[PDB]
Amino acid sequence: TPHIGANRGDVAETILLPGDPLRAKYIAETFLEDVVQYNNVRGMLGFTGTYKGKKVSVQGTGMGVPSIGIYSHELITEFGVKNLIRVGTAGSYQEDVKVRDVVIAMSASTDSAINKLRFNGADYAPTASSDLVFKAYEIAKAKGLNVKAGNVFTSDTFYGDDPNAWKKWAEFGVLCVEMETAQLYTTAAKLGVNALTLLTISDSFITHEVTSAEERQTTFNEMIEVALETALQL
Amino acid sequence: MGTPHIGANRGDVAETILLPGDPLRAKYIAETFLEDVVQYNNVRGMLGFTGTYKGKKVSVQGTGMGVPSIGIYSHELITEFGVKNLIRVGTAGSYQEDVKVRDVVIAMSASTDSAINKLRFNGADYAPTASSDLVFKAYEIAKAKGLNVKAGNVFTSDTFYGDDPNAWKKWAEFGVLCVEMETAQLYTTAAKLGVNALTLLTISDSFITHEVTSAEERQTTFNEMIEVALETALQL
Amino acid sequence: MGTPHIGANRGDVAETILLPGDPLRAKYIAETFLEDVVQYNNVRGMLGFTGTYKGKKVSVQGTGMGVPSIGIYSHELITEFGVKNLIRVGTAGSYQEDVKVRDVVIAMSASTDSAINKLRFNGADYAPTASSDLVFKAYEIAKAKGLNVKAGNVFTSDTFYGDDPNAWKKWAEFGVLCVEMETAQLYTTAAKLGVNALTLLTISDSFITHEVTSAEERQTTFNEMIEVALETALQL
Amino acid sequence: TPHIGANRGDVAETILLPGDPLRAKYIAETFLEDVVQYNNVRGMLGFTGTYKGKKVSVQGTGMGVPSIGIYSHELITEFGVKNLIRVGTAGSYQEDVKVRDVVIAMSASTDSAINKLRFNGADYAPTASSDLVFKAYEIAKAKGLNVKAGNVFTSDTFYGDDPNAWKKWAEFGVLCVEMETAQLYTTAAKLGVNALTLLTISDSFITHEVTSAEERQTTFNEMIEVALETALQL
Amino acid sequence: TPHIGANRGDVAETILLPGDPLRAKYIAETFLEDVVQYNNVRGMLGFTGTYKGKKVSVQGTGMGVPSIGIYSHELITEFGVKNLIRVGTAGSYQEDVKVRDVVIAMSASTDSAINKLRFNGADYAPTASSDLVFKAYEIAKAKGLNVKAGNVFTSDTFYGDDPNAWKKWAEFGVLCVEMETAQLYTTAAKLGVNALTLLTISDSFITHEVTSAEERQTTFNEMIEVALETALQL
Amino acid sequence: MGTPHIGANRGDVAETILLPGDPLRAKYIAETFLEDVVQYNNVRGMLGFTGTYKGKKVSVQGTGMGVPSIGIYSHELITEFGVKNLIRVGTAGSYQEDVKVRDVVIAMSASTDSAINKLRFNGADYAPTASSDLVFKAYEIAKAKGLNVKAGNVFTSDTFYGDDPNAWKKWAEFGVLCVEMETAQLYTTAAKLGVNALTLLTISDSFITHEVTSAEERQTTFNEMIEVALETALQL
């Protein structure tokens, strides 16, 4: 409510969640029919339309655990959302994981304290909904995409103090780093709904390639198609 | 051209910047208080503007909500665009009976439940702290404006919707004035990079009372805060 | 010859291994499902066997209970004996009403109260995660076998007899399927060493219901799990 | 009571708190009139007198968070003290911060666990009373002292294992290291009273200058004058 | 019960606890008369017999804090065991501590989280029963053994990532590393019974000597004799 | 001459030192038990003395209260003045019914809520431990003196006035004998620097009973403890 200026009914049961509200705009204009914009509070654009006849929503979450914490909670509790598919970007930690590859997050490691606080310092592993993982994987394979499914690192920090810090995570099989998933999976689990993160590799700690701002906003089409086809099967 | 989060050139951003959380509030500040306004950023809709206030160049830009979001923007602004003075202008919820709605709070420091510094200092407690020159200038301006100003510790929360309704009380017992979501990061980043930072906050609600205020009332108080921030900007 | 915990030579262990906690369960699996069985380990009574399943070499070995115990065995098996695929086959207690006794759980990941990774990552939260190729193969086999299969997060407990009877509930609220004592270590070690790991679990009891099952019933379900693990082994 | 051998009434509402009881003695003999010694328990000297007609107290706290924890608590709860002004010494972490400079602590970073324990591992920032900060700053400026006001580090450890450990703190703007303030500010906040720390730089991690024991006890007059003038305005 | 397949009465009041069940077998066959095997669940052999006329038990615990946590709890609560003497192996952290030396653990440092969780992150020091320490020390000295008594490190990890990690512990006087004692001492203290760990040095971080599997199982006789003589006096 | 906290020369301090928390107790010990006493320290009023006991040189010095205070004094004494044996002689509050007022406790080890070692060992649990030679000598002396002596774990508290009246109980359930404020630091420092340390404690009050004792009674028991410490000193 304080953050989404709309009524229950305005948002579909399944929603795609880019971090960038302008990417939500792009998805809505490019892939959906009969689009209605239901939110402009804080510029966090949210749209509802149809994809091949099925109602779907798309809305920006902003960057970081706390921002997506706010939007995922409100979407679930106040708008009755049941399936949440993050479509985001991430920096590769693996030579095997290339700029513009698509990755499924089975789980999310994190340096956020959100769960450390709640479990008295133990290690909760935020985990994807298996059904969504399986469906998204199958759709991807049927499309010719060599999609990997594994652990991603959700960081609070884009500009770390130590340029070599990523290497410890990569040694333990972490595919890439992004900034939202540990929170999305935690909240989905807590509230009894379903969540999946798909990512497009936008930067690389191996080769140091950086995609442009325009490229991230309007050209990562493969992940969007996977997410939409996934939504269609839910 | 720019950074992956700010699509502008060096020179497009003034040396002093105001930092509302909401990019629509940046647009409002720019339209309301600045002359000859140019928009330098639209990446991710994170509106940023540059204009003059009483003849002096000043910028204003949304940061998004939360420590990680402002961490990205403050870092890029300082290292890529040469920003020297960063003044957050936000809203907060009061934890104290004598911190009333429509009061202005100056953050001397920020407590937090974010893990950003716990990681950095091997589990020790770093206290993110405001630039004193900015605290002193802002206080004297606010006072002379006749405003009800408090200066103290604020709580930078990582979690808006927490498990425990009463958890704020522990912080309130230890004198914390109010809760917001950005300041510990702003102060840490400015300290690391050797620049100047200040957070000003209008009290928009109270965990203690349930006083209601009109939109006109809220606008007037917000404008007062912005004036304090801009008159501060003038003296740097 | 060997390591201080496995008294065998390189070559004695197949590239894929099943890992019951109980070495008497390793003996049972070997006798029941494997041909031309050779025992390669008796050090500390930690029985390990190598035989063929449908003509393919496969090993099976007890790990002991707990993160430190499986930490020793998995490390030695991988680094000294060249094991590439490690499939734990265990029992677990259900934390969920729809995770019923005699169900099979595939661990996609493992939460834990062990400090092994807290130490490694400076207090951050590493999520030990299964090899997806093994998760996908095992799921499809179990499904086609008509089994009631769930795939999700399991809790690797350091303490069987804890101070607090209700402590599991916090984990259950956050979707944890069941509790066991080895998986976070198995997944972390396999990830570090660049090999493949999977945990399969039969639900032996419930924290929610108190359903009773016969030994024949328990044997049948256990055999089904082993078949899934061995049919998975076949495709690697 | 177990630690201060005196009755309510014997201590003034405003008190100066050096760590060194012999420095309390010095302040009392040098700056106060009509001095009465109210405490000698454990040799922790405490005096009450007048400064320009206003009643003030001065008492040693001992070194370290736990010692000042004891004395600040007893002073507030049993003796009705309302304003607590620590006048201490500290080692510089900044080239800008010279031996014999005076510093105001706006806040205190710490490696003490006192607050980690209480806030479930979150980061409480012990903070000075703004009124005292402003008054002390103004008095200092009117005296010709270039006083800095910023973050100080309260350590449990004088002799650290790592000779380079201080450098991380200095990178993040920490002015100097002392051993009391995080506790004084925490207790003052908890009990609803007012606190300020003034420090004289007695050692330097930059130049390695060390002042003598005599110098710390009887020659740091500038901070004492600021504190007394501050008390006078309260 | 789930882990020990026997009835109250089958186990004596004093028990020796090697980690290795085959070492329990060795002790029982070599030192005890009238031996009965009371446990074979999970192959964790347990025996009861007499040593010089006094009933004693010996049982394997398995390796690691969680495994001994299980067996020590069941032994105490369900079988009425009152004295628990671990007879284990450990790797030396001190040039002074040689392969085949015998060590008494007065206390156990640990990297286990078992107590961090329980004491809100404070530092509980698991400590031996003084009576058993004194008796075992005296017996050892009367045998000609130069026995050391000090702090041992209970680790969850045999194969650490950092080959130099042990050096910090050795600097602070840690004698050797093993994998059970912090748990045994914690549980004994909690349940109000008595515990002692004796160790034989089986590996050395100084010289890199490694004893064989056979040697650990059947040749560490000196510690066994000390433990048995200790039991006899209880 | 000296250190910033001890105003004396090398040679002024004996190789064995007794360490009361209270410097007035150091003065009392020196006057009561030592011959040919010289005061070597008055810095910060932290009285230190050197005299002979039965012809042997021994020192005695106040440490102040708390881990940080004794951290300074023990470090300087060892590294600058060549002290080899450090024996704290203090008071403590009992956590146990069979640890009665006027009993003597020998600290085998010290639990703590200080963060000194949590920082040092990356969040692991170091157990500060007494020198066994000193534990054994002191126990045998105390026993032969007919004293009621206990040897075990003590709790080194960082906070005298804690938030929670019942918090000691957790420690009491896990066998902790009593609470004091210095020992974890003393034992850690002596271990680091390769020297010998022991804490002896007279039980001055009880968290369990509320027994009252006369000053004469308290003096007698304290003198007994000092005798144990000094007879121990004699044999080093």
PDB file of C-alpha atoms in Angstrom, chain C residues 32-235:
ATOM      1  CA  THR C  32      20.948 -56.478  -1.730  1.00  0.00           C
ATOM      2  CA  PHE C  33      21.636 -54.593  -4.972  1.00  0.00           C
ATOM      3  CA  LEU C  34      25.222 -55.169  -6.066  1.00  0.00           C
ATOM      4  CA  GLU C  35      27.025 -58.061  -7.773  1.00  0.00           C
ATOM      5  CA  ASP C  36      30.627 -59.234  -7.299  1.00  0.00           C
ATOM      6  CA  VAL C  37      31.019 -57.223  -4.104  1.00  0.00           C
ATOM      7  CA  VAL C  38      34.439 -56.494  -2.612  1.00  0.00           C
ATOM      8  CA  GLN C  39      34.874 -54.785   0.774  1.00  0.00           C
ATOM      9  CA  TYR C  40      37.594 -52.095   0.518  1.00  0.00           C
ATOM     10  CA  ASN C  41      37.277 -50.496   3.987  1.00  0.00           C
ATOM     11  CA  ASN C  42      37.044 -51.615   7.593  1.00  0.00           C
ATOM     12  CA  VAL C  43      38.993 -48.765   9.227  1.00  0.00           C
ATOM     13  CA  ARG C  44      37.027 -47.621  12.330  1.00  0.00           C
ATOM     14  CA  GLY C  45      34.347 -50.122  11.207  1.00  0.00           C
ATOM     15  CA  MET C  46      33.341 -47.683   8.445  1.00  0.00           C
ATOM     16  CA  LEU C  47      32.351 -50.359   5.955  1.00  0.00           C
ATOM     17  CA  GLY C  48      32.834 -49.543   2.260  1.00  0.00           C
ATOM     18  CA  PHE C  49      32.056 -51.817  -0.688  1.00  0.00           C
ATOM     19  CA  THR C  50      32.454 -51.858  -4.465  1.00  0.00           C
ATOM     20  CA  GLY C  51      30.339 -53.943  -6.830  1.00  0.00           C
ATOM     21  CA  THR C  52      28.423 -53.645 -10.065  1.00  0.00           C
ATOM     22  CA  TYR C  53      24.856 -52.522 -10.663  1.00  0.00           C
ATOM     23  CA  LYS C  54      23.544 -53.596 -14.090  1.00  0.00           C
ATOM     24  CA  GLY C  55      27.163 -54.142 -15.149  1.00  0.00           C
ATOM     25  CA  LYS C  56      28.417 -50.731 -13.937  1.00  0.00           C
ATOM     26  CA  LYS C  57      30.918 -50.296 -11.102  1.00  0.00           C
ATOM     27  CA  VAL C  58      29.438 -48.492  -8.085  1.00  0.00           C
ATOM     28  CA  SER C  59      30.626 -48.068  -4.494  1.00  0.00           C
ATOM     29  CA  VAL C  60      28.773 -47.671  -1.194  1.00  0.00           C
ATOM     30  CA  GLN C  61      30.175 -46.576   2.145  1.00  0.00           C
ATOM     31  CA  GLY C  62      29.001 -45.469   5.595  1.00  0.00           C
ATOM     32  CA  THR C  63      29.820 -41.850   6.552  1.00  0.00           C
ATOM     33  CA  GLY C  64      29.022 -41.697  10.264  1.00  0.00           C
ATOM     34  CA  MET C  65      26.692 -39.063  11.697  1.00  0.00           C
ATOM     35  CA  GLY C  66      27.275 -35.378  11.542  1.00  0.00           C
ATOM     36  CA  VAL C  67      28.990 -32.735   9.499  1.00  0.00           C
ATOM     37  CA  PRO C  68      32.522 -33.428  10.770  1.00  0.00           C
ATOM     38  CA  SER C  69      32.324 -37.163  10.099  1.00  0.00           C
ATOM     39  CA  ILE C  70      31.079 -36.922   6.502  1.00  0.00           C
ATOM     40  CA  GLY C  71      33.604 -34.046   6.056  1.00  0.00           C
ATOM     41  CA  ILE C  72      36.450 -36.510   6.591  1.00  0.00           C
ATOM     42  CA  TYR C  73      35.030 -39.282   4.352  1.00  0.00           C
ATOM     43  CA  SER C  74      33.857 -37.117   1.458  1.00  0.00           C
ATOM     44  CA  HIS C  75      37.199 -35.223   1.341  1.00  0.00           C
ATOM     45  CA  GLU C  76      39.310 -38.419   1.286  1.00  0.00           C
ATOM     46  CA  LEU C  77      37.042 -40.183  -1.241  1.00  0.00           C
ATOM     47  CA  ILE C  78      37.248 -37.250  -3.667  1.00  0.00           C
ATOM     48  CA  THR C  79      40.937 -36.286  -3.271  1.00  0.00           C
ATOM     49  CA  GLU C  80      42.513 -39.716  -2.709  1.00  0.00           C
ATOM     50  CA  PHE C  81      40.188 -42.162  -4.476  1.00  0.00           C
ATOM     51  CA  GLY C  82      39.005 -40.047  -7.384  1.00  0.00           C
ATOM     52  CA  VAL C  83      35.260 -40.135  -6.622  1.00  0.00           C
ATOM     53  CA  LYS C  84      33.308 -37.826  -8.980  1.00  0.00           C
ATOM     54  CA  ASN C  85      29.661 -38.401  -7.979  1.00  0.00           C
ATOM     55  CA  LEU C  86      28.549 -38.683  -4.381  1.00  0.00           C
ATOM     56  CA  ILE C  87      24.949 -39.594  -3.552  1.00  0.00           C
ATOM     57  CA  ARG C  88      23.932 -39.561   0.101  1.00  0.00           C
ATOM     58  CA  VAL C  89      21.030 -41.911   0.840  1.00  0.00           C
ATOM     59  CA  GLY C  90      19.606 -41.208   4.295  1.00  0.00           C
ATOM     60  CA  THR C  91      16.638 -40.804   6.592  1.00  0.00           C
ATOM     61  CA  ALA C  92      15.142 -37.542   7.815  1.00  0.00           C
ATOM     62  CA  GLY C  93      12.407 -36.160  10.093  1.00  0.00           C
ATOM     63  CA  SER C  94       9.664 -34.179   8.360  1.00  0.00           C
ATOM     64  CA  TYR C  95       9.005 -30.550   9.274  1.00  0.00           C
ATOM     65  CA  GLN C  96       5.969 -30.244   6.940  1.00  0.00           C
ATOM     66  CA  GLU C  97       2.451 -31.701   6.862  1.00  0.00           C
ATOM     67  CA  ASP C  98       2.667 -32.406   3.113  1.00  0.00           C
ATOM     68  CA  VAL C  99       6.057 -34.104   3.567  1.00  0.00           C
ATOM     69  CA  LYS C 100       4.661 -37.465   4.722  1.00  0.00           C
ATOM     70  CA  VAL C 101       6.409 -40.499   6.201  1.00  0.00           C
ATOM     71  CA  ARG C 102       7.722 -42.747   3.373  1.00  0.00           C
ATOM     72  CA  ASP C 103       7.979 -39.773   0.973  1.00  0.00           C
ATOM     73  CA  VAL C 104      11.340 -39.249  -0.763  1.00  0.00           C
ATOM     74  CA  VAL C 105      13.022 -35.838  -0.441  1.00  0.00           C
ATOM     75  CA  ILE C 106      15.664 -34.578  -2.840  1.00  0.00           C
ATOM     76  CA  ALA C 107      17.826 -31.919  -1.172  1.00  0.00           C
ATOM     77  CA  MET C 108      18.202 -28.971  -3.577  1.00  0.00           C
ATOM     78  CA  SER C 109      20.131 -27.187  -0.823  1.00  0.00           C
ATOM     79  CA  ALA C 110      20.972 -27.452   2.898  1.00  0.00           C
ATOM     80  CA  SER C 111      20.454 -24.950   5.672  1.00  0.00           C
ATOM     81  CA  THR C 112      22.622 -25.607   8.755  1.00  0.00           C
ATOM     82  CA  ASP C 113      23.562 -24.589  12.278  1.00  0.00           C
ATOM     83  CA  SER C 114      27.081 -25.936  11.774  1.00  0.00           C
ATOM     84  CA  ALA C 115      29.718 -23.190  11.781  1.00  0.00           C
ATOM     85  CA  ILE C 116      31.784 -24.672   8.923  1.00  0.00           C
ATOM     86  CA  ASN C 117      30.902 -21.978   6.370  1.00  0.00           C
ATOM     87  CA  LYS C 118      30.327 -19.099   8.802  1.00  0.00           C
ATOM     88  CA  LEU C 119      34.048 -19.439   9.511  1.00  0.00           C
ATOM     89  CA  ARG C 120      35.017 -19.755   5.824  1.00  0.00           C
ATOM     90  CA  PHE C 121      33.014 -16.732   4.520  1.00  0.00           C
ATOM     91  CA  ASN C 122      33.695 -14.258   7.364  1.00  0.00           C
ATOM     92  CA  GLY C 123      30.183 -14.609   8.852  1.00  0.00           C
ATOM     93  CA  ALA C 124      28.265 -14.464   5.542  1.00  0.00           C
ATOM     94  CA  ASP C 125      25.665 -17.112   4.486  1.00  0.00           C
ATOM     95  CA  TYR C 126      26.840 -19.682   1.940  1.00  0.00           C
ATOM     96  CA  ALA C 127      24.022 -21.898   0.621  1.00  0.00           C
ATOM     97  CA  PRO C 128      25.318 -25.462   0.032  1.00  0.00           C
ATOM     98  CA  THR C 129      23.653 -26.579  -3.191  1.00  0.00           C
ATOM     99  CA  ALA C 130      23.125 -29.910  -5.037  1.00  0.00           C
ATOM    100  CA  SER C 131      24.432 -30.615  -8.558  1.00  0.00           C
ATOM    101  CA  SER C 132      21.473 -29.802 -10.829  1.00  0.00           C
ATOM    102  CA  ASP C 133      22.230 -32.618 -13.287  1.00  0.00           C
ATOM    103  CA  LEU C 134      21.815 -35.107 -10.420  1.00  0.00           C
ATOM    104  CA  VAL C 135      18.694 -33.375  -9.027  1.00  0.00           C
ATOM    105  CA  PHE C 136      17.032 -33.499 -12.482  1.00  0.00           C
ATOM    106  CA  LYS C 137      17.957 -37.118 -13.199  1.00  0.00           C
ATOM    107  CA  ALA C 138      16.850 -38.326  -9.757  1.00  0.00           C
ATOM    108  CA  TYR C 139      13.522 -36.426  -9.904  1.00  0.00           C
ATOM    109  CA  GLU C 140      12.575 -37.866 -13.314  1.00  0.00           C
ATOM    110  CA  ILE C 141      13.481 -41.393 -12.172  1.00  0.00           C
ATOM    111  CA  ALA C 142      11.529 -41.084  -8.887  1.00  0.00           C
ATOM    112  CA  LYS C 143       8.499 -39.608 -10.724  1.00  0.00           C
ATOM    113  CA  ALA C 144       8.493 -42.366 -13.367  1.00  0.00           C
ATOM    114  CA  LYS C 145       8.788 -44.860 -10.494  1.00  0.00           C
ATOM    115  CA  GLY C 146       5.476 -43.372  -9.304  1.00  0.00           C
ATOM    116  CA  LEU C 147       7.106 -42.147  -6.063  1.00  0.00           C
ATOM    117  CA  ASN C 148       5.896 -39.241  -3.946  1.00  0.00           C
ATOM    118  CA  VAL C 149       8.919 -36.992  -4.411  1.00  0.00           C
ATOM    119  CA  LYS C 150       9.606 -33.484  -3.039  1.00  0.00           C
ATOM    120  CA  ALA C 151      12.588 -31.306  -3.859  1.00  0.00           C
ATOM    121  CA  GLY C 152      13.684 -28.488  -1.589  1.00  0.00           C
ATOM    122  CA  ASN C 153      15.664 -27.198   1.338  1.00  0.00           C
ATOM    123  CA  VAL C 154      16.645 -29.560   4.187  1.00  0.00           C
ATOM    124  CA  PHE C 155      18.179 -28.653   7.586  1.00  0.00           C
ATOM    125  CA  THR C 156      21.637 -30.095   8.454  1.00  0.00           C
ATOM    126  CA  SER C 157      21.548 -30.178  12.255  1.00  0.00           C
ATOM    127  CA  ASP C 158      24.649 -30.174  14.456  1.00  0.00           C
ATOM    128  CA  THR C 159      22.665 -31.175  17.556  1.00  0.00           C
ATOM    129  CA  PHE C 160      20.349 -34.197  17.839  1.00  0.00           C
ATOM    130  CA  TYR C 161      19.401 -33.497  21.487  1.00  0.00           C
ATOM    131  CA  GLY C 162      18.809 -29.711  21.539  1.00  0.00           C
ATOM    132  CA  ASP C 163      17.849 -27.469  24.502  1.00  0.00           C
ATOM    133  CA  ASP C 164      14.572 -26.331  22.862  1.00  0.00           C
ATOM    134  CA  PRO C 165      11.729 -28.691  21.780  1.00  0.00           C
ATOM    135  CA  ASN C 166      10.112 -25.980  19.605  1.00  0.00           C
ATOM    136  CA  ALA C 167      13.232 -24.698  17.817  1.00  0.00           C
ATOM    137  CA  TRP C 168      12.485 -26.640  14.574  1.00  0.00           C
ATOM    138  CA  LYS C 169       9.368 -24.506  14.065  1.00  0.00           C
ATOM    139  CA  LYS C 170      11.259 -21.391  12.952  1.00  0.00           C
ATOM    140  CA  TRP C 171      12.865 -23.499  10.187  1.00  0.00           C
ATOM    141  CA  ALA C 172       9.503 -25.091   9.294  1.00  0.00           C
ATOM    142  CA  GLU C 173       7.924 -21.591   8.923  1.00  0.00           C
ATOM    143  CA  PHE C 174      10.587 -20.796   6.333  1.00  0.00           C
ATOM    144  CA  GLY C 175       9.793 -23.867   4.217  1.00  0.00           C
ATOM    145  CA  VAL C 176      12.483 -26.325   5.379  1.00  0.00           C
ATOM    146  CA  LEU C 177      11.301 -29.827   4.435  1.00  0.00           C
ATOM    147  CA  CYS C 178      13.078 -31.984   6.998  1.00  0.00           C
ATOM    148  CA  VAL C 179      16.091 -32.437   9.255  1.00  0.00           C
ATOM    149  CA  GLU C 180      19.150 -34.668   8.792  1.00  0.00           C
ATOM    150  CA  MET C 181      22.840 -34.315   9.784  1.00  0.00           C
ATOM    151  CA  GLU C 182      25.194 -34.490   6.814  1.00  0.00           C
ATOM    152  CA  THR C 183      24.104 -32.654   3.665  1.00  0.00           C
ATOM    153  CA  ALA C 184      25.466 -29.123   4.155  1.00  0.00           C
ATOM    154  CA  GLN C 185      28.952 -30.629   4.485  1.00  0.00           C
ATOM    155  CA  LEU C 186      28.541 -32.981   1.518  1.00  0.00           C
ATOM    156  CA  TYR C 187      27.389 -30.178  -0.818  1.00  0.00           C
ATOM    157  CA  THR C 188      30.061 -27.704   0.387  1.00  0.00           C
ATOM    158  CA  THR C 189      32.903 -30.226  -0.044  1.00  0.00           C
ATOM    159  CA  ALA C 190      31.737 -31.352  -3.522  1.00  0.00           C
ATOM    160  CA  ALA C 191      31.436 -27.723  -4.612  1.00  0.00           C
ATOM    161  CA  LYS C 192      34.927 -26.871  -3.311  1.00  0.00           C
ATOM    162  CA  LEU C 193      36.479 -29.861  -5.034  1.00  0.00           C
ATOM    163  CA  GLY C 194      34.542 -29.437  -8.309  1.00  0.00           C
ATOM    164  CA  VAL C 195      32.584 -32.697  -8.179  1.00  0.00           C
ATOM    165  CA  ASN C 196      28.906 -33.770  -8.111  1.00  0.00           C
ATOM    166  CA  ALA C 197      26.700 -34.427  -5.117  1.00  0.00           C
ATOM    167  CA  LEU C 198      23.085 -35.237  -4.323  1.00  0.00           C
ATOM    168  CA  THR C 199      21.192 -36.146  -1.190  1.00  0.00           C
ATOM    169  CA  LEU C 200      18.155 -38.393  -1.232  1.00  0.00           C
ATOM    170  CA  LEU C 201      16.182 -38.889   1.974  1.00  0.00           C
ATOM    171  CA  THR C 202      13.393 -41.202   3.044  1.00  0.00           C
ATOM    172  CA  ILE C 203      11.069 -39.647   5.605  1.00  0.00           C
ATOM    173  CA  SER C 204      11.302 -41.945   8.621  1.00  0.00           C
ATOM    174  CA  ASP C 205       9.322 -39.842  11.120  1.00  0.00           C
ATOM    175  CA  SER C 206       7.377 -36.562  11.411  1.00  0.00           C
ATOM    176  CA  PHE C 207       7.589 -33.605  13.817  1.00  0.00           C
ATOM    177  CA  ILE C 208       3.966 -32.999  12.933  1.00  0.00           C
ATOM    178  CA  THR C 209       2.195 -36.352  12.789  1.00  0.00           C
ATOM    179  CA  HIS C 210       2.947 -39.526  14.723  1.00  0.00           C
ATOM    180  CA  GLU C 211       2.174 -42.144  12.077  1.00  0.00           C
ATOM    181  CA  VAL C 212       3.582 -45.668  12.669  1.00  0.00           C
ATOM    182  CA  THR C 213       5.066 -47.808   9.850  1.00  0.00           C
ATOM    183  CA  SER C 214       6.045 -51.486   9.775  1.00  0.00           C
ATOM    184  CA  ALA C 215       9.641 -52.642   9.208  1.00  0.00           C
ATOM    185  CA  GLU C 216       8.486 -54.257   5.919  1.00  0.00           C
ATOM    186  CA  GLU C 217       6.906 -50.913   4.901  1.00  0.00           C
ATOM    187  CA  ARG C 218      10.136 -49.084   5.852  1.00  0.00           C
ATOM    188  CA  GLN C 219      12.303 -51.584   3.977  1.00  0.00           C
ATOM    189  CA  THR C 220      10.196 -51.275   0.770  1.00  0.00           C
ATOM    190  CA  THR C 221      10.431 -47.453   0.756  1.00  0.00           C
ATOM    191  CA  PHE C 222      14.163 -47.539   1.494  1.00  0.00           C
ATOM    192  CA  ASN C 223      14.706 -49.985  -1.398  1.00  0.00           C
ATOM    193  CA  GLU C 224      12.805 -47.631  -3.717  1.00  0.00           C
ATOM    194  CA  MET C 225      15.178 -44.774  -2.742  1.00  0.00           C
ATOM    195  CA  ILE C 226      18.225 -46.930  -3.327  1.00  0.00           C
ATOM    196  CA  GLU C 227      16.859 -47.879  -6.761  1.00  0.00           C
ATOM    197  CA  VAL C 228      16.469 -44.166  -7.596  1.00  0.00           C
ATOM    198  CA  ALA C 229      20.043 -43.557  -6.420  1.00  0.00           C
ATOM    199  CA  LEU C 230      21.379 -46.550  -8.415  1.00  0.00           C
ATOM    200  CA  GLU C 231      19.379 -45.737 -11.593  1.00  0.00           C
ATOM    201  CA  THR C 232      20.750 -42.210 -11.224  1.00  0.00           C
ATOM    202  CA  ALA C 233      24.281 -43.653 -10.849  1.00  0.00           C
ATOM    203  CA  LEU C 234      23.729 -45.560 -14.125  1.00  0.00           C
ATOM    204  CA  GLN C 235      23.259 -42.329 -16.114  1.00  0.00           C
TER     205      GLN C 235
END
